[PDB]
Assembly symmetry: C2
Homo-oligomer: 106 residues x 2
């Protein structure tokens, strides 16, 4: 279903860096990662335990929907990391080069 | 400004592969690329002439807002490739691993 440009612009996609990956004590397959957006530190709950080992996620440049309305998952989460998934594999999005943390995706 | 989850779900972010990069005769800095979404072939107008040489964009796995309402830019365009930009550099988003073309980003 076609989406209008403003419907896209409403989203604030930013580039961030995962600073901490901790296990979410209150959910089996969720990780509680902290993302560094340069001016702020978004801590969000992401389900990547099944596809990523903490060692892999740390220091990774990821893409997050920064302005997603805060939620309580267990623990407080704000935003989500984007990753593609072809029903089989799950692969996080990332810039092809490094950029100022908090870089606007458009 | 907080965005509701459905406001995010409205968008169809897909992984695609750039099959062709041609110069847009009717605009200085625009490229007219064709993206392979696996089941379809989205041809969209992207302004990357300034940051990417055709040789670099070809065979690249990129992320596109598939369901963006078709537009006439000059030439017909549907959707747009996502790239981060810290006001200086411009870096396309891409999966960290390869995935079925047309893979849903979420």
């Amino acid at each position: 279903m076609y989406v209008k440009f403003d419907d896209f612009a409403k989203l604030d996609l930013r580039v961030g860096k995962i600073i901490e990956v901790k296990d979410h004590p209150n959910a089996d397959k969720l990780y509680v990662v902290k993302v560094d957006l340069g001016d702020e530190v978004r801590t969000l709950v992401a389900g990547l335990k099944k596809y990523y080992k903490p060692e892999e996620l740390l220091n990774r440049y990821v893409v997050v929907v920064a302005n997603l309305e805060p939620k309580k998952l267990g623990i407080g989460s704000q935003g989500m990391l984007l990753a593609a998934d072809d029903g089989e594999r799950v692969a996080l999005l990332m810039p092809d080069k490094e950029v100022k943390l908090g870089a606007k995706v458009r």
